[PDB]
Paper text:
Here we show that Arabidopsis thaliana possesses a highly XMP-specific phosphatase (XMPP) which is conserved in vascular plants. We demonstrate that XMPP catalyzes the irreversible entry reaction of adenylate-derived nucleotides into purine nucleotide catabolism in vivo, whereas the guanylates enter catabolism via an unidentified GMP phosphatase and guanosine deaminase which are important to maintain purine nucleotide homeostasis. We extended the substrate survey for this enzyme to other mononucleotides and found that it is highly specific for XMP. The loop probably stabilizes the orientation of the cap domain. XMPP is a member of the Haloacid Dehalogenase (HAD) protein superfamily with unique characteristics since HAD enzymes typically have either a protruding loop or a cap structure, but not both, like XMPP.
To elucidate the molecular basis for this specificity, we determined the crystal structure of XMPP with and without XMP bound. In the complex with XMP, the 5′-monophosphate moiety of XMP provides an equatorial ligand across Asp184 in the Mg2+-coordination shell, and the ribose and xanthine moieties face toward the cap domain. Unlike the ribose moiety, xanthine embedded on the concave side of the cap domain interacts extensively with the enzyme via (i) hydrophobic interactions with Val28 and Ile32 and (ii) by base stacking with Phe55, and (iii) via direct or water-mediated indirect hydrogen bonds of O2 with Thr61, O6 indirectly with Arg51, and N3 and N7 indirectly with Tyr77 and Lys29, respectively. The interaction of Asn188 with the phosphate and of various residues with the xanthine moiety are required for full activity. Further kinetic analysis revealed that mutations of xanthine-interacting residues do not affect the kcat but the KM values for XMP. For variants altered in hydrophobic residues, the KM increases 2.2- to 26.9-fold. For those changed in hydrogen bond-forming residues, the KM increase ranges from 3.6- to 9.9-fold.
Author numbering: 3 to 238
Write the structure that this text describes.
């Protein structure tokens, strides 16, 4: 028996379902950003977005790695600031569940804090989490202090550097912590640093997923150890 003292949640397409429609809007906004920046065709923009997302986990990270001094605020204002936030549905079931859960709850998102806070507000979860590790948390040196774009490379999930930042800032014991995320590479990363893992958004587990649920509220029944009251580890 291994107790769970902490639950760490990704945000986008983890705490709201993919069908919400934010994911396609983000892709479109990134493409529009690249067209605005570089005068690309839309086809070339999309091609570049997917290339940079695949290689660096983020178009912003990718642009900066390629020498372009794009300020995170400019990027997030365009790409997240233009999102259809009204499309995110409140989820009282999820709110009720998180209120019932006695474990520490932490947000671990690649998105910026401004986006994260707006999303949680729409969901009605604005007071459910104890800590938020977001883009800024992982990239302190991209703000204020001027740098060459290669000086402080953007740190984001699935990097193990990102995982460590979450674990240190939130002060968690990976042995007692479950990580929920909709992205398989993020799940693999979390498993590598010793976390228990829940793949959100699919019913079928990947190799590094201890659990998999299509909707995050399903953990109420899919992971019964969340309700276990024993405080210390033990065998049988
Ligand atoms: O370069 C990209 N191409 C994409 O298709 C894409 N879709 C989502 N995003 C970004 O993913 C992050 C989602 O945050 P979570 O850690 O909370 O799921 C946030 O940082 C989003 O901006 C994309 N970035
Ligand atoms: Mg996600």
């Amino acid at each position: 028996f291994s107790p769970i003292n902490c639950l760490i949640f990704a945000l986008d397409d983890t705490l709201y379902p993919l069908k919400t429609g934010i994911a396609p809007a983000v892709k479109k906004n990134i493409d529009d950003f690249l067209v605005e920046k570089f005068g690309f065709s839309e086809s070339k923009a999309s091609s570049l977005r997917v290339e940079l997302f695949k290689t660096y986990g983020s178009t912003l990270a990718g642009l900066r790695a390629l020498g372009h001094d794009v300020h995170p605020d400019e990027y997030h204002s365009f790409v997240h600031g233009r999102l259809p936030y009204g499309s995110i549905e409140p989820n009282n079931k999820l709110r009720n569940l998180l209120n019932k859960i006695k474990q520490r709850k932490i947000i671990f998102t690649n998105s910026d804090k401004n986006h994260a806070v707006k999303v949680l507000k729409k969901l009605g979860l604005e007071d459910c989490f104890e800590e938020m590790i977001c883009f800024e948390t992982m990239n302190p040196n991209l703000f204020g202090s001027t740098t060459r774009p290669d000086e402080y490379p953007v740190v984001l999930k699935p990097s193990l550097t990102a995982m460590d930042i979450c674990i240190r800032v939130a002060n968690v014991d990976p042995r007692r912590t479950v990580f929920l995320d909709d992205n398989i590479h993020n799940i693999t990363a979390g498993k590598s640093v010793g976390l228990r893992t829940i793949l959100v958004g699919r019913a079928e587990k990947t190799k590094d997923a201890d659990y998999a649920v299509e909707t995050v509220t399903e953990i109420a029944t899919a992971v019964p150890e969340i309700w276990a009251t024993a405080t210390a580890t033990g065998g049988f």
